[PDB]
Design an enzyme around this catalytic site. Structure first.
Site, short mmCIF file in Angstrom:
data_model
loop_
_atom_site.label_atom_id
_atom_site.label_comp_id
_atom_site.label_asym_id
_atom_site.label_seq_id
_atom_site.Cartn_x
_atom_site.Cartn_y
_atom_site.Cartn_z
N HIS B 476 -19.81 31.91 -33.91
CA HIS B 476 -18.91 31.52 -32.84
C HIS B 476 -18.04 30.36 -33.31
O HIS B 476 -18.10 29.24 -32.80
CB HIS B 476 -19.71 31.14 -31.60
CG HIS B 476 -20.29 32.32 -30.88
ND1 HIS B 476 -21.50 32.27 -30.23
CD2 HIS B 476 -19.81 33.57 -30.70
CE1 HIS B 476 -21.76 33.45 -29.70
NE2 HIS B 476 -20.75 34.26 -29.96
C1 LIG Z 1 -22.08 39.55 -36.30
C2 LIG Z 1 -21.23 38.88 -35.26
C3 LIG Z 1 -21.54 39.04 -33.92
C4 LIG Z 1 -20.77 38.44 -32.93
N1 LIG Z 1 -21.12 38.63 -31.61
C5 LIG Z 1 -20.40 38.06 -30.70
C6 LIG Z 1 -20.78 38.27 -29.32
O1 LIG Z 1 -21.73 38.95 -28.94
N2 LIG Z 1 -19.96 37.63 -28.42
C7 LIG Z 1 -18.86 36.85 -28.73
O2 LIG Z 1 -18.22 36.33 -27.81
N3 LIG Z 1 -18.52 36.65 -30.04
C8 LIG Z 1 -19.25 37.24 -30.96
N4 LIG Z 1 -18.91 37.05 -32.28
C9 LIG Z 1 -17.75 36.21 -32.59
C10 LIG Z 1 -16.45 37.00 -32.68
O3 LIG Z 1 -16.56 38.06 -33.63
C11 LIG Z 1 -15.32 36.06 -33.12
O4 LIG Z 1 -15.54 34.78 -32.54
C12 LIG Z 1 -13.92 36.53 -32.75
O5 LIG Z 1 -13.78 37.91 -33.10
C13 LIG Z 1 -12.83 35.71 -33.41
O6 LIG Z 1 -11.98 36.59 -34.18
P1 LIG Z 1 -10.53 36.15 -34.61
O7 LIG Z 1 -9.55 37.31 -34.38
O8 LIG Z 1 -10.15 34.88 -33.95
O9 LIG Z 1 -10.65 35.93 -36.17
P2 LIG Z 1 -11.01 37.10 -37.18
O10 LIG Z 1 -11.24 38.35 -36.43
O11 LIG Z 1 -12.18 36.63 -38.04
O12 LIG Z 1 -9.76 37.21 -38.13
C14 LIG Z 1 -8.59 37.95 -37.75
C15 LIG Z 1 -7.87 38.41 -38.99
O13 LIG Z 1 -7.16 37.30 -39.58
C16 LIG Z 1 -6.96 37.62 -40.93
N5 LIG Z 1 -6.64 36.40 -41.65
C17 LIG Z 1 -7.44 35.30 -41.82
N6 LIG Z 1 -6.89 34.34 -42.53
C18 LIG Z 1 -5.64 34.85 -42.86
C19 LIG Z 1 -4.57 34.32 -43.60
N7 LIG Z 1 -4.58 33.12 -44.18
N8 LIG Z 1 -3.46 35.09 -43.73
C20 LIG Z 1 -3.44 36.30 -43.16
N9 LIG Z 1 -4.39 36.89 -42.44
C21 LIG Z 1 -5.47 36.11 -42.32
C22 LIG Z 1 -8.25 38.30 -41.38
O14 LIG Z 1 -7.95 39.27 -42.38
C23 LIG Z 1 -8.78 38.95 -40.09
O15 LIG Z 1 -8.72 40.38 -40.15
C24 LIG Z 1 -19.67 37.65 -33.30
C25 LIG Z 1 -19.36 37.48 -34.64
C26 LIG Z 1 -20.13 38.09 -35.63
C27 LIG Z 1 -19.77 37.89 -37.07
#
Ligand SMILES: Cc1cc2nc3c(=O)[nH]c(=O)nc-3n(C[C@H](O)[C@H](O)[C@H](O)COP(=O)(O)OP(=O)(O)OC[C@H]3O[C@@H](n4cnc5c(N)ncnc54)[C@H](O)[C@@H]3O)c2cc1C
Ligand SMILES: COC1=C(OC)C(=O)C(C/C=C(\C)CC/C=C(\C)CC/C=C(\C)CC/C=C(\C)CC/C=C(\C)CC/C=C(\C)CC/C=C(\C)CC/C=C(\C)CC/C=C(\C)CCC=C(C)C)=C(C)C1=O
Ligand code: HEC
Ligand code: HEC
Ligand code: HEC
Ligand code: F3S
Lengths: 413, 540, 136
Positions: B476
């Protein structure tokens, strides 16, 4: 519910006059994928401005049966006026009363249908009706058969208009009376033969199976999908059990229309006890996008085997139908299966919703390409359904486009 | 490519980025979606997970199904790919899971979307611990429900489960009924005085959005074979269909700005290490809790040698997570974990109180992942044969129990993501290196968390009780670019715009102020939709 | 093609079950022979041992040769047939999932994590006991 409401339900008038599940009640705006283009159904709420509030009894009868609007313009044959033409005068009056009084008027103009020349001009349809032999004496009770048979014939031919989609059309695109209920292509989907043919049709179906399919839309060997799912959800489910029994009684007496090259009924196709080897799938680990897994068995296992398990016998509960012994898979022509892969089955019977995850190019769960879907469908036919059925990528693209362009549709050039 | 011009760019096609793109294209804005990872497909992930060795399946391995592409590597600890360097007193508490690829790490979450309590947004004001959000809970509730309806979140519509976030309108779903394990756990913890409550899940109890109803595979982590949960790939697909341009394998490294501090363009690599200048009138960085700070510290230029958006010298600082202590044992009374989703119920009795001024709130959840793989591996490990092995497999799969408890950390500015000065990938971009520390706050909370968990196991009559002496990561990833009012004390404002660069927004876990006591991705989605409102107001 | 027959016979003896896929057995033999060239010699030796000492069940075939270095490969073969992997690292190939015999004795209640169990709301029904053996 009143007689008018029952007749509106049986006629399934709400299927095309309400654009999808959303939209107002009988406000029109629904897009119908006609072979020559997209046609928008009109509003029929008692609205004095954009509805039919100005429609009188004779005007309503003309519009319902002879397909003539208030202004005299011929209604397009998306209107099953060729199917409502034999509707009795009393039922027409009851429907008129129900529409004029029992549905709230909606003031929202429907989109105007635009078709290429000469389908734009809504006046050549007089010759179309003359050649279609639409008229069309109002239905009369046939004393040769019992009352149940007559009621079933009335439901199938006039109200529920099953012949609108289960009967093929000629080059002039009018119902083919020779091949009555012989099955037809309605674009993306194909309505199967529902005659009394034991192999080609549904003659080998048990009475309970047919009743279950026509009432709830689900059966051990068949699940209502696409337009049939819409019909089950909107009209057939609300039909009383007596009417379903009458429809079954009529359907078990229609003349058979056997298909060439068919020897086993669509639900008696056993499945080969074969599958894919997990060892072969190790090599494609650490390789996403499925571009390299061109084989069919592993593709089916990865994509769809979660619900219809590896053996293909479906879920033990019956929620996920057995791909073996299935009419959609057992059909010699696989258009229904391709449509189920592309768009999927979404049937809401008694507020309980089946829902396919769609697997088309614009799928939300898993997009698949034409060749990919062709390979997986070939595996399903070979191992679960009709082995003699074959699916090509061009066939999948054609099904996506809305089926064969009918030879009358090429005229728009 | 001479120049990849656009209107609005969003770095990172994850759940936050995909929601941002969907909302912005829905309003008629040319949105260009850059993603470091590759185009990722659900069915192939399912196939890879099916073929993982049962040894990696007994343990909770969630990175093997997603290949770690060399240009955009993501964490993988079974071979210890060492992408996420973590050190400090609790280096093992931040070995987070992240997936790079269209959809992001939420490709493999449990969909445990949660609504934070009103006190989570005023922790600092009400207890003096932590830092406060510039936004109250009421200011976020509209967008919060917007995201909730967007992903189709479950929830106990009619229930006074526990002191929780007030709802202006109920959940779009009703929570699917418990399995045997969840019911028995609820009864046990009720006899222990703990309140076991249904967990809101971004999951289909009834068919939603054209995605089928949850049939209870129990593989919510790390891939849904039928897609009955919600993943960011859904919003990415919706944005792409609506007009958003998506380029996977787009790892941005630096961006140029004028003397006005209005950043003008960005650049990224393919795997082939080719730079492409991307120009848009409003950039948004929605990468990760971890990747957003690494990107901001990696894109330092002559005008901003200390890092972009790092005028306060706090980007990368102030890391946050939910330090979970996962404890697995063998129940004396059968449980049969596996019915339903991996995360169905959790004890919410301790999500708030007056003790937050002293120690962290704990959310004791029971992991519902099936133990058939774990039972088989453990029974085969002890070298049993024949009918005895079968009996032991059945016993250990009907009695397998996993229990955990998550907490919150206070803002420690020392928790940097200073990029390692020695490790680089094929692109030469340095790995994100975390100097992580939990705090005496977390130690004090865990001091009673251990006793609580041990009591829960005792009520079950558990055997071979294994407790992690350390803290397990819950992925998280919040904090890193803390929001607030002062440009010299926080990174971005209430509307998630960087104080240094008004045209730059960041919508991810980095802007999250207090980690809270429960899952956060629903909060990241709500913040992303608030950001979408911000750009919508900006460009009209 | 004798070797596959002896492999299947010994495996059905060792796991104590009869319904075993032939494709999975062929893959297991291929993996074992790729791992060790002398697999055939010791497998024939083991078969001769069972024939000469007229073994009845696998508990005796486990207990009797604790010091013999052939018991290792019996443990390996039962591990392969119950789990579907030969090696121990993450790279190790999987030859049996959703059919591995370690998932079978709990298949009636606990869902195989990816392949859906019956229906979408099955878990509301109470499960069976712990001491009943479903099948196989
Ligand atoms: C096993 C697991 C279980 C989880 N279970 C839960 C749950 O039950 N409930 C909950 O609320 N949360 C849960 N989470 C948390 C949740 O997955 C994340 O908090 C949320 O998806 C955040 O994702 P995001 O899009 O912000 O970043 P991400 O999805 O990690 O990244 C988005 C994209 O950004 C791209 N990126 C990164 N840096 C760069 C860069 N410099 N340039 C270009 N592209 C870039 C990456 O390629 C990636 O595809 C879980 C996480 C995991 C790992
Ligand atoms: C100008 O001169 C000429 C004429 O007139 C002398 C003509 O008649 C015609 C002949 C052409 C027509 C009049 C055909 C008109 C037909 C349409 C415009 C639409 C056809 C609609 C149907 C066949 C309705 C049935 C379709 C179904 C059931 C689809 C399924 C729908 C759901 C699932 C809901 C031509 C070419 C012409 O040259
Ligand atoms: C992998 C791509 C497949 C394939 C080849 C099929 N399905 Fe499904 N399916 C599901 C449900 C719920 C139904 C039926 C309706 C219900 O009972 O509510 C079906 C139906 C089919 C059919 C029959 C269609 C018909 O017209 O009779 C066929 C041939 C078929 N499926 C093949 C459910 C699901 C899924 C959710 C778990 C998934 C995934 C699939 N199906 C995938 C596939
Ligand atoms: C009047 C009430 C009827 C009756 C008695 C039936 N239908 Fe239809 N039907 C339609 C489509 C597109 C399908 C196939 C779906 C798929 O391919 O999966 C069907 C299917 C049937 C069956 C099943 C036969 C089998 O699968 O072998 C039966 C018994 C059946 N129908 C009877 C389409 C329509 C339709 C729109 C064009 C309308 C109206 C009806 N059907 C109406 C009826
Ligand atoms: C499956 C589609 C469908 C069904 C069923 C259907 N309609 Fe229609 N209806 C249409 C279409 C399409 C048109 C317009 C096409 C045309 O102009 O030729 C139309 C036109 C009409 C009109 C002409 C009004 C005008 O201003 O255009 C009336 C009245 C009408 N329908 C009433 C009914 C009634 C009553 C029923 C029985 C409940 C019914 N319809 C069932 C599709 C349908
Ligand atoms: S993977 Fe999906 S079908 Fe249910 S068990 Fe998890 S939400």
């Amino acid at each position: 519910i009143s007689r008018g409401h029952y007749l509106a339900i049986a006629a399934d008038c709400a299927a095309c006059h309400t654009n999808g599940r959303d939209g107002q009640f009988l406000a029109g705006g629904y897009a119908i994928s006609s072979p020559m283009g997209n046609i928008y159904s009109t509003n029929i709420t008692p609205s004095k401005t954009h509805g039919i509030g100005n429609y009188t009894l004779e005007q309503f009868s003309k519009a319902l049966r002879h397909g003539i609007r208030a202004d005299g313009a011929q209604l397009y044959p998306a209107m099953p006026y060729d199917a409502y033409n034999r509707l009795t005068d009393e039922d027409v009056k009851s429907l008129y009363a129900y529409i004029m009084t029992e549905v709230k008027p909606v003031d929202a103009p429907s989109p105007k249908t635009q078709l290429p020349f000469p389908f734009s001009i809504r006046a050549s349809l007089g010759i179309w009706k003359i050649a279609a032999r639409i008229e069309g004496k109002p239905y009369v009770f046939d004393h040769t058969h019992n009352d149940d048979w007559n009621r079933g014939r009335y439901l199938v031919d006039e109200l529920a208009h099953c012949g609108e989609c289960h009967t093929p059309r000629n080059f002039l695109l009018a119902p083919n009376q020779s091949a009555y209920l012989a099955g037809a292509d309605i674009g993306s989907w194909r309505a199967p033969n529902i005659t009394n043919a034991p192999q080609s049709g549904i003659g080998s179906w048990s009475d309970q199976d047919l009743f279950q399919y026509l009432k709830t839309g689900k059966t051990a060997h068949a699940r209502a999908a696409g337009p049939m799912a819409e019909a089950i959800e909107h009209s057939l489910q609300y039909l009383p059990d007596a009417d379903i029994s009458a429809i079954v009684t009529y359907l078990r007496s229609v003349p058979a229309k056997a298909e060439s090259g068919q020897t086993v009924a669509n639900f008696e196709h056993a499945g080969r006890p074969s599958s894919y080897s997990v060892a072969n799938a190790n090599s494609r680990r650490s390789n996403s996008t499925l571009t390299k897994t061109t084989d069919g068995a592993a593709l089916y296992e990865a994509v769809c085997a979660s619900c219809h398990q590896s053996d293909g016998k479906g879920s033990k509960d019956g929620y996920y139908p057995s791909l073996v012994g299935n009419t959609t898979t057992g059909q010699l022509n696989p258009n229904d299966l391709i449509a189920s892969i592309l768009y999927g089955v979404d049937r809401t019977t008694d507020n309980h919703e089946i829902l396919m995850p769609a697997f088309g190019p614009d799928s939300l769960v898993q997009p698949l390409t034409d060749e990919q879907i062709a390979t997986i469908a070939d595996y399903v036919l070979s191992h679960f359904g009709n082995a003699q059925a074959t699916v090509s990528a061009d066939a999948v693209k054609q099904v996506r486009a809305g089926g064969k362009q009918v030879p009358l549709a090429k005229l728009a050039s | 490519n001479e120049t990849l011009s656009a209107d609005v760019v969003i770095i990172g096609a994850g759940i936050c980025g995909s929601l941002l793109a969907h909302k912005l294209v829905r309003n008629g804005l040319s949105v260009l979606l850059l993603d470091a990872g590759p185009r990722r497909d659900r069915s192939q992930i399912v196939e890879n997970w099916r073929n993982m060795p049962p040894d990696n399946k007994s343990q909770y391995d969630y990175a093997t199904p997603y290949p770690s592409v060399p240009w955009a590597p993501h964490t993988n600890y079974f071979p210890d790919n060492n992408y996420l360097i973590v050190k400090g007193p609790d280096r093992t508490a931040y070995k987070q899971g992240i997936i790079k690829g269209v959809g992001g790490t939420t490709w493999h979450w449990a969909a445990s979307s949660w609504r934070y309590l009103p006190n989570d947004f005023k922790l600092h004001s009400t207890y003096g611990v932590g830092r406060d959000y510039a936004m109250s809970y009421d200011e976020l509730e509209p967008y919060y429900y917007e995201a909730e309806c967007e992903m189709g979140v479950m929830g106990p519509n009619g229930e006074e489960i526990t002191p929780s976030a007030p709802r202006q309108n109920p959940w779009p779903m009703t929570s699917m009924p418990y399995g045997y394990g969840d019911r028995t756990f609820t009864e046990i913890v009720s006899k222990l005085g703990f309140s076991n409550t249904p967990v809101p899940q971004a999951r289909n109890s009834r068919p939603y959005d054209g995605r089928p109803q949850c049939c209870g595979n129990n593989n919510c982590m790390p891939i849904c074979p039928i897609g009955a949960m919600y993943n960011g790939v859904y919003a990415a697909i919706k944005a792409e269909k609506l007009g958003a341009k998506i380029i996977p394998n787009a790892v941005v490294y630096a961006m140029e700005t004028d003397a006005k501090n209005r950043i003008t363009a960005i650049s990224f690599y393919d795997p082939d290490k080719q730079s492409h200048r991307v120009v848009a009138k409003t950039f948004v960085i929605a990468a990760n809790g971890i990747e957003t700070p690494k990107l901001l510290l990696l894109a330092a230029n002559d005008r901003n040698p200390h890092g972009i958006a790092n005028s306060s010298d706090l980007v990368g600082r102030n890391m946050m997570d939910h330090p979970g202590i996962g404890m697995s044992f063998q129940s004396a009374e059968p449980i049969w974990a596996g019915g339903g989703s991996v995360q169905m119920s959790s004890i919410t009795n301790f999500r708030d109180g007056d003790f937050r001024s002293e120690y962290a709130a704990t959310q004791i959840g029971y992991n519902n992942t099936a133990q058939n793989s774990r039972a088989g591996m453990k029974a085969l490990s002890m070298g049993l044969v024949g009918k005895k092995l079968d009996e032991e497999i059945r016993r250990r799969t009907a009695h397998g129990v996993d229990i955990y408890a998550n907490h919150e950390v206070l803002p420690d500015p020392n928790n940097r993501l200073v990029l390692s000065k020695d490790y680089k990938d094929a692109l030469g971009i340095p790995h994100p290196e975390v100097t992580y520390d939990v705090g005496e706050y977390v130690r004090k909370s865990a001091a009673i968390s251990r006793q609580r968990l041990m009591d829960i196991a005792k009520a079950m009559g558990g055997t071979e009780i294994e407790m992690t002496p350390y803290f397990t990561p819950n992925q998280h990833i919040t904090g890193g670019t803390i929001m607030g009012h002062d440009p010299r004390d926080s990174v971005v404002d209430k509307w998630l715009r960087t104080h240094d660069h008004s045209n730059l927004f960041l919508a991810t876990g980095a802007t999250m102020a207090a980690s809270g006591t429960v899952n956060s991705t629903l909060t990241m989605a709500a913040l992303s939709l608030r950001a979408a409102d911000a750009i919508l107001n900006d460009l009209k | 093609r004798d070797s596959i027959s002896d492999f299947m016979q010994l495996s059905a003896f060792a796991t104590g079950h009869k319904n075993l896929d032939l494709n999975i057995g062929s893959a297991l033999l291929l993996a074992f022979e790729a791992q060790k060239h002398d697999f055939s010699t010791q497998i024939k030796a083991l078969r001769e041992h069972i024939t000469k000492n007229n073994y009845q069940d696998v508990e005796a075939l486990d207990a009797a040769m604790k010091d013999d270095p052939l018991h290792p490969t019996l443990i390996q073969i039962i591990r392969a047939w119950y789990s579907g992997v030969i090696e121990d690292e993450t790279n190790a190939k999987v030859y049996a999932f959703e059919k591995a015999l370690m998932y079978q004795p709990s298949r009636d209640v606990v869902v195989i994590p990816t392949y859906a169990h019956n229906g979408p709301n099955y878990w509301v029904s109470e499960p069976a006991s712990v001491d009943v053996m479903p099948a196989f």
